[PDB]
């Protein structure tokens, strides 16, 4: 009858927001599309989003997936075109010192293949931003990267000019955007390689401080811990974007979300001794067991008072995983520009 | 421990006992006596436990005056206002049992770990204290203070640490200034919690915090709490809670019949049972989260700056001066 | 450039003009009109340049008003608020003659970097500043502010960058917080300097501030500095002249004649013959070295309070509220 | 006739505190004694303080003195027996990455050479303190030293346990000093080596930031950047203790005495085209050329305005130095606990 289990409760326009809000979240390997492209590759099985290349390595420890999307797949999935890069150690932890060791290595070496089609030469300007409010814990990757990315710089060949770095703060205090902000510089430096450091939000609470994400697709609107972002792209300002983020918090509703859906998916998978088996548990879990991702989380927006929406969730150690990739980002980009830009 | 709550007005009984009471009636049942109160805009909360009150609800027996301003924002200078004169005024009763003089000792400790943000209202609160006292012509030498931070890498619990520098400094009074975790988020940063039952075991952000209490190192200790976090369980369950109370109010005391069928049969349930099926079914991992305002580093400025003015204008007042 | 300083009052010329007109006489030289005062315990110093002094002196045309309160202490409760008074007066008079209303825009800036103690006062004011507005219910939406540190490491120069937020937010006043290098220790930490000649090149602890002007960016552009350093060569000639002059008093106004042969020929010297013969022999790295009192963190704390008190009083009483 | 030519213009009594302040100076090697057996050896010579001996060595750009203090030359020259190793790299840079690695070399190499005969094993429990006050940028050696130190035992085989670590701050404001309060910490965690981390002060401004003074007689009293440091030593506790203190400031009245003796001393070198040539300069420069660094300094002591000696000197860069000297000082402590200790 009708196309949406919601209707009638959720207002179609809380849903359709709420699907907005999930194909602009961070990680890309988190979109519905790329997860359903990802399992369809049964020995190759259609692929109803077309304009998505996704490679899968592994390296040791650490999980590559490169994603390249069209400007079809853009479309269709509302991200930018361009490419993912996403490396992935699930075992990690802050002692993990050979999973960041690891970490460390695929990070210099999908540094240079995003950047090899740049041409990128011992005369070029790289300017990098880390973005982020430094006394809001998993917000402060990007300030605390660029702090460690000053001191190797003194015990390192790479003289500071051709290497230019700053940390905006929140600019809003003086009455600019992290984007006018981010153009005010780059015009007067000329830069030809801008990076972005920045914290970024998972859906899943288990990818927190797990992955690094990579693209030439710059930040996204929208994005970060205060999904406040404005495009900082090679479209917004001329000079090509590469973003460096680490996931660091979740959104509170989009954590009561996937809780709600892991309850059914845990009790799903236990019949008979990850999909959800709708017919077997609505009856004891109710209509909202048929729902999607995004009719809860309008749901949430509705019924839950406004300060959730305000609130975000982070690891009782996140000032630990801060310093242990703040000091990952800062060395992998150091290496790679010894080794692959000016030596 | 379901639930877990650092704000005794949020325990089960004391919400009862509090329903019990404003129906106006009598009939409690813990034994524990609670003055309600309101001066302005500040809801103020005495709460007396006796040995009664402690064994049945979890809490240690002594004195809990809890103030709130419900509509508190970071740019509510008059709500932070009359917040400090109630907690200037709170802390002499507390304490006027106490009969401390020009000659007492006051040590004053923030707990917390400054670099997680909502942790950090225990050394924020001791740094601005700090610059208070030198910026007054009064040498406060009757005042010592210290933020511990995070005594565990020196191989010392807080507990001990504490005491190491009490059982030299030899104070009188210990207050401790924290935050805490707590169960409603809509509570978060517009409570102070004064008590003189110090500070509790597995209290705060970590679920991990040591007693400091008469009891552990027998100097009086006081503890001035601001809740801070909620545990991402709890918010969990509080806000599916919450889902089934506002859609059954909006259909016409939670109606279970009508939204039985569309959200489940989990509608009826308590919220130990609802925390305990999502103890057994999320990962671990949520254990080891928090959860806790965007704007929660104004939060912090805000009540150190408070907490530090509220105990130096109750000091020079009414133990001073 | 000998006996570097960035107090106007501490140039020769002002040192003299200052003796000509105590002396109850008029003949100055320079062509600058200087008036003293005195506030209860803050002395004011109005000092007017035009372009006869501009050229003749090395400093910018324009008017510098000096507040110093000589027995300045970090406890000195009384003594930091007269000068906080002083300061929103001379703010107002300053910028009278600009005619500001509710709707100019206001943009503060904190030089310095945080690192630095002493370089500090820009920044930790900002910080202040920022933590007072949001304290206040008032927007301030009229009112931006920025602490840009170390603008060298993104290959742009303070002045630029200055230009950069000031092109965009297109300001009609740009207030410039600093610490400044003095040429006596005594000075230190216990003036503040306000002018509407903004940031001179090369003052600072770094020696090397670009030019903030009037003249630079095409808005007004005022300087708020309080001297914190002196830089190490400086300091040597002015203690070495101390030497001099207590001795040759306490003998029975240099007495050269009586201290010569204990002191040497160099005792009849100049300031800048002392200066240049120390910049010949010692070792160039004495050049790097800055001098700062060891209680500097608590001055910044201090200071960096004041200023933006200053400010935001005068912002709301006499160009909005 | 008289035997100190102050006499009549100095008080007797200020000369003799300021003779106390410099053998109370933090650098050994900048005692006069220390320096006068070192030009004393030319095929050696008699050697007037004879419970000095003075090994020189010399291993890339580290220049290496290793110095020990028996019990009479300790009565003699003020400072408490021991051993002394103070390492140098006089061209030292904030940006020489390989001095810097040289230095992290020998300061390992000590590190085990002044701690052999203590037999430490793999179960030993290692207290290591960073003393100084953080918003003090030269004092803020021992604190950054602790946070660099805690941050490298995450990726370290190093279990946080065994090693235990604190920076207490300005502990005046809890009513306890430096002392007590190392000692209230080592009574409950019963170490077997104490580390104390801090800031000295050079005589000599050329020495800043560009030495280690490595000593097992611990931080002696009047020491540090506050010249107010209470003994923490083996004496004072009952653990052995270890002081690495790295020069970063200059008394104000220190640094103009030495720069009066640089006046004296250059004029003098350059007669016919480091001695004081008395008679040459004393018609031009007065009566003072003759006096000690001592005299001169009760001098100022009696004439300067008392503001004068809270103030200090560091460079311009001290920041970097910081950073550069707190990043040396951890990771020669760990190295050395890593190869010679636990594993």
Same mark, same amino acid.
């Given at each position: 009858?009708?196309?949406?289990?919601?209707?009638?409760?959720?207002? #179609?326009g809380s849903h359709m927001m709420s699907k907005i809000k %999930?194909?602009?979240?961070?990680?890309?390997?988190?979109?519905? &599309?790329?997860? +359903?492209? #990802?399992? &369809?590759?049964?020995?190759? !099985?259609?692929?109803?989003?077309?304009?998505?290349?996704?490679?899968?390595?592994?390296?040791? $420890?650490?999980?590559?997936?490169?994603?390249?999307?069209?400007?079809?797949?853009?479309?269709?999935?509302?991200?930018?075109?361009?490419?993912?890069?996403?490396?992935?150690?699930?075992?990690?932890?802050?002692?993990?010192?050979?999973?960041?060791?690891?970490?460390? +290595?695929?990070?210099?070496?999908?540094?240079?293949?995003?950047?090899?089609?740049?041409?990128? !030469?011992?005369?070029?300007?790289?300017?990098?931003?880390?973005?982020? *409010?430094?006394?809001?814990?998993?917000?402060?990757?990007?300030?605390?990267?660029?702090?460690? @990315?000053? &001191?190797?710089?003194?015990?390192?060949?790479?003289? %500071?000019?051709?290497?230019?770095?700053?940390?905006?703060?929140?600019?809003?205090?003086?009455?600019?955007?992290?984007?006018? %902000?981010?153009?005010?510089?780059?015009? #007067?430096?000329?830069?030809?390689?801008?990076?972005?450091?920045?914290?970024?939000?998972? $859906?899943?609470?288990?990818?927190?401080?797990?992955?690094?994400?990579?693209?030439?697709?710059?930040?996204?609107?929208?994005?970060?811990?205060?999904?406040?972002?404005? &495009?900082?792209?090679?479209?917004?300002?001329?000079?090509?974007?590469?973003?460096?983020?680490?996931?660091?918090?979740?959104?509170?509703?989009?954590?009561?979300?996937?809780?709600?859906?892991?309850? %059914?998916?845990?009790?799903?998978?236990?019949?008979?001794?990850?999909?959800? *088996?709708?017919?077997?548990?609505?009856?004891? @879990?109710?209509?909202?067991?048929?729902?999607?991702?995004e009719?809860?989380?309008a749901?949430?927006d509705?019924?839950?008072?406004? $300060?959730?929406?305000?609130?975000?969730?982070?690891?009782?150690?996140?000032?630990?995983?801060?310093?242990?990739?703040?000091?990952?980002?800062?060395?992998?980009?150091? *290496?790679?520009?010894?080794?692959?830009? @000016?030596?």
């Amino acid at each position: 009858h009708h196309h949406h289990h919601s209707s009638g409760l959720v207002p #179609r326009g809380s849903h359709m927001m709420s699907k907005i809000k %999930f194909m602009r979240s961070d990680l890309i390997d988190e979109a519905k &599309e790329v997860v +359903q492209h #990802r399992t &369809e590759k049964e020995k190759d !099985t259609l692929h109803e989003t077309p304009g998505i290349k996704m490679k899968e390595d592994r390296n040791g $420890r650490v999980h590559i997936t490169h994603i390249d999307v069209d400007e079809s797949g853009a479309e269709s999935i509302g991200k930018k075109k361009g490419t993912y890069i996403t490396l992935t150690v699930p075992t990690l932890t802050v002692e993990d010192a050979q999973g960041f060791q690891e970490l460390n +290595q695929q990070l210099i070496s999908s540094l240079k293949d995003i950047h090899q089609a740049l041409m990128l !030469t011992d005369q070029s300007k790289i300017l990098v931003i880390g973005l982020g *409010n430094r006394t809001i814990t998993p917000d402060a990757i990007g300030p605390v990267a660029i702090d460690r @990315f000053h &001191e190797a710089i003194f015990s390192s060949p790479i003289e %500071f000019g051709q290497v230019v770095y700053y940390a905006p703060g929140v600019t809003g205090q003086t009455g600019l955007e992290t984007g006018e %902000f981010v153009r005010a510089i780059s015009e #007067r430096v000329k830069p030809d390689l801008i990076i972005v450091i920045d914290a970024l939000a998972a $859906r899943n609470q288990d990818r927190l401080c797990k992955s690094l994400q990579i693209t030439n697709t710059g930040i996204h609107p929208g994005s970060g811990v205060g999904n406040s972002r404005n &495009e900082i792209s090679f479209e917004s300002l001329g000079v090509p974007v590469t973003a460096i983020g680490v996931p660091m918090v979740v959104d509170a509703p989009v954590l009561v979300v996937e809780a709600i859906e892991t309850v %059914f998916k845990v009790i799903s998978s236990q019949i008979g001794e990850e999909p959800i *088996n709708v017919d077997a548990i609505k009856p004891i @879990f109710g209509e909202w067991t048929a729902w999607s991702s995004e009719e809860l989380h309008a749901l949430l927006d509705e019924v839950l008072p406004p $300060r959730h929406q305000q609130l975000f969730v982070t690891p009782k150690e996140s000032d630990a995983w801060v310093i242990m990739h703040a000091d990952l980002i800062q060395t992998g980009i150091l *290496n790679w520009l010894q080794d692959d830009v @000016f030596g």
